[PDB]
Structures are given as C-alpha cells and as structure tokens.
Amino acid sequence: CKYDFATSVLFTEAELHTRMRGVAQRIADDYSNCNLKPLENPLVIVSVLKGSFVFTADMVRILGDFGVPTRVEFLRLCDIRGKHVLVLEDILDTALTLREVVDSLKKSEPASIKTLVAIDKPGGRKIPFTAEYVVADVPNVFVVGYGLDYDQSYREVRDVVILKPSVYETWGK
Amino acid sequence: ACKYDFATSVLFTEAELHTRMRGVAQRIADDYSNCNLKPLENPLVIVSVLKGSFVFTADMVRILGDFGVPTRVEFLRCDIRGKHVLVLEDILDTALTLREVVDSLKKSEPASIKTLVAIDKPGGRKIPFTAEYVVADVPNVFVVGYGLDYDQSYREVRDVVILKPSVYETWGKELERR
Ligand SMILES: Nc1nc2c(ncn2[C@@H]2C[C@@H](COCCP(=O)(O)O)N(C(=O)CCP(=O)(O)O)C2)c(=O)[nH]1
Ligand SMILES: Nc1nc2c(ncn2[C@@H]2C[C@@H](COCCP(=O)(O)O)N(C(=O)CCP(=O)(O)O)C2)c(=O)[nH]1
C-alpha cells in the first residue's frame, strides 16, 4: 500500500471512474426516452451525505459526458413532482438513510426515482434495499477515501482504502 | 467553432483548470509548511461556500492531498478556533458573499484564514476584496461549467464556457410565467 495510513487499496480512482462510465452508459440508455434536456427537463440529482460531494462531482460530469443533463440538490428541497430523480450516495450500508430519503421523495410524486451509490456494503444492511446502480462492492471493512471519511478526515484520498487499524485505535484514545 | 452547442466560447478547459490548481496547490503547501498540517490532529479546514462550489472543492481537496495538504471540508449553502481555515468558492464577483463569510468566521478566532476561488471576476466587486489564491480571472462575461450554473443547469460542463445569449434570453422569457 502506497498509503502509510492504509493496509490495502481496494479501488483506485481509475477503477472507480471506469466503473462509473459503465453505469453512465446504462443511465443514458435507461433514460433514453425521458427527453432529458438542460433547464427544460434535467435529471434531478439528489446527493446524500456530506462525503458524497466527491462522487457527485465526478458522476455528474461523467453523466454529462454521456449526454445526460443534470441538476444537483444536496441534503447532507426543490421541485421534483413530475420530474425524474436519481439519488446518489457515496456509501450504502444499513440502507436506513436511503430508504428514508427515497420514501419521503416519493411523497412528491416524481416521474420516476432510482438510486446510485459509489460504494455498496452488501453485508451491512439492517433492512432489505437494492440500489438500481452500484459502482463497486466492499466487504465488511472500514474504508476511507473518495469522499468517505474517518472523523471528517481522509475524504480527499483519491482511492477507497482500508484504514490502518492503528489510525482509529489511537484516535479514539 | 465551439464544441458546445450552448456556448459561444470555451475559456478554460478541465485540464487547464487542473494545471492552474496544481500551481496553486504548490503555493498552499509552501505557505502552510510551517503549520504541521496533519489528518485528524490538525487538518486544514476547507469551508466550501456556494452550492456549485462542490465541483471545485472535490477537485481541489484531491489536488491538495497530492501535495501533502490534508483537509477536512465543511459546506455553507464546526469548531474552527485555533484551526487554519481556507475558504473555497467557485466564483468571486461582487465579493459580498465572501466578505460576509470571512468576517463571520474571524469571530471564531481561527489560527488563520485565507480564500481560494476558481473564477475571479476582478471587475465585479461591490466592495474591495482580494482572494489569496485565484485559479483564473474572467472578465464581464456570463460563464458556466466546472460547477457554475445557469438556473441550476450546466454545472456538469467540464470546462468554464461563455453561455450563448440565446439560451438565457430564451429561458428568462420562459421564467416569466404569471
Ligand atoms: N468512511 C467510512 N464510513 C462508513 C463505512 N461503513 C459505513 N459507514 C458510514 C457510517 C454512517 C455515517 O456516515 C456518515 C457519512 P458523512 O460524514 O458524509 O455524512 N453511515 C450511514 O449512516 C449511511 C447509512 P445508509 O447509506 O446505508 O443508508 C455510513 C466505511 O466502511 N468507511
Ligand atoms: N454561472 C455563473 N454565475 C455568476 C457569474 N457571475 C456572477 N455569477 C453569480 C451570481 C451570484 C449567484 O451565485 C450563484 C452560486 P449557486 O447558485 O451555486 O449557489 N453569485 C454570487 O452571489 C457570488 C457572491 P461573490 O462572488 O461576489 O462573493 C455568483 C457567471 O459568469 N457565471
């Protein structure tokens, strides 16, 4: 590991962007008949969690690459009724946050609504929940990077790494 | 001959923005070299102001990390006493927002405080204000991209472009509903 605060690099910046391009192609095809256009009818991007800003910034730019115009909202509301909504989240774990955000947004009745997460932790669920688009899976380990923090730190790490246990063991004390 | 059907001209590409952000990142490293910036213990507190500033913030913190500047980010659209604060903003124009934030933040008595803007309109000031770091200047022209929006749209354009007048001449008359 090139990082002195990590035991392993799980996904590099290039790997994530490669995967996110595969997802952007699915989104473009998926919404091909939604008549998405700037101002008139963009895809409403609802970014959840403070750390999601890194992923949201890269995803929205990649989405524009594939002809998907967007409009970003942050909850870390606008006018979603009748409009297509895509919730983005950097990590999906217990799914308790996503379920609540999805259910509440439905109260506004948008044309459609789907979710996209950068890191899915399939093994952390406390309720059933599947995201329409997943960039990468991560086992049951504490990772930081790509916006994911440990106590507000390491968000800027370009890759998704396993935080060396000596880091958070010494920081709690 | 523009690559964007909605823009008259492209001012700064993503790559050019990053090349500039690399030069800025080196200066910040030198400037804070005596501050012992360290993750968790003493990170440089990044205050990102303005909704569209998430794009510049996402890229800037990452570049800064490349140059040995560990950061933690807050958003304005925490404890700062004794900490080093770098306010980040995608566009600086009248300076009214940045003046409010900086002077409101000085009340908490941080270790220091500076500002870094991606786009500085030197000629738009309503009050005097100079940013400590500026990635690039822009004149009296309406631009979009790199997080800068026109009515929430076009933030995702990877470059800072001048938006075609027909777009906002048309959309304004559409916003006129009543
Ligand atoms: N760095 C890092 N964090 C992890 C990891 N596993 C879980 N988490 C966090 C833990 C908690 C707080 O998250 C603040 C995010 P923030 O600071 O940006 O606000 N979470 C949620 O509550 C999401 C519920 P879900 O998404 O399932 O609905 C996700 C990991 O492995 N590494
Ligand atoms: N896209 C684009 N916007 C421009 C341009 N010139 C000015 N603005 C805006 C105008 C107003 C709205 O700001 C939206 C931020 P948001 O919608 O993301 O929240 N602003 C401020 O008040 C900054 C306070 P200052 O900089 O003086 O301290 C900046 C341009 O050329 N292109």
Numbering used by the authors:
A (entry chain B): 5 to 80, 101 to 197
B (entry chain A): 4 to 80, 102 to 202
What does the article say, verbatim?
The key enzyme in the salvage pathway is hypoxanthine–guanine–(xanthine) phosphoribosyltransferase (HG(X)PRT)4. Inhibition of hypoxanthine–guanine–xanthine phosphoribosyltransferase activity decreases the pool of 6-oxo and 6-amino purine nucleoside monophosphates required for DNA and RNA synthesis, resulting in a reduction in cell growth. Five compounds synthesized here that contain a purine base covalently linked by a prolinol group to one or two phosphonate groups have Ki values ranging from 3 nM to >10 μM, depending on the structure of the inhibitor and the biological origin of the enzyme.
5 is a nanomolar inhibitor of both human HGPRT and TBrHGPRT1 (Ki = 3 nM). In human HGPRT, it is the phosphonate group attached to the carbon atom of the prolinol ring that enters the 5′-phosphate binding pocket whereas, when 5 is bound to TBrHGPRT1, it is the group that is attached to the nitrogen atom. It is hypothesized that the loop surrounding this 5′-phosphate binding site is less flexible in TBr than the counterpart in the human enzyme. Therefore, this loop is unable to move out to accommodate the longer linker and, as a result, the two phosphonate groups occupy alternate binding pockets in the human and Tbr enzymes. The carbonyl group in the TBrHGPRT1·5 complex does not form any interactions with active site residues. There are no magnesium ions in the TBrHGPRT1·5 complex, and, as such, divalent metal ions do not play any role in anchoring this molecule in the active site. In the case of the TBr enzyme, the phosphonate group is held in position by only three hydrogen bonds. However, these bonds, together with the other interactions in the active site, are sufficient to result in a high affinity of the compound for the enzyme. The prolinol ring in TbrHGPRT1 is rotated by ∼90° compared to its binding to the human counterpart. The TBrHGPRT1·4 complex refines as a dimer, while the TBrHGPRT1·5 complex refines as two dimers.
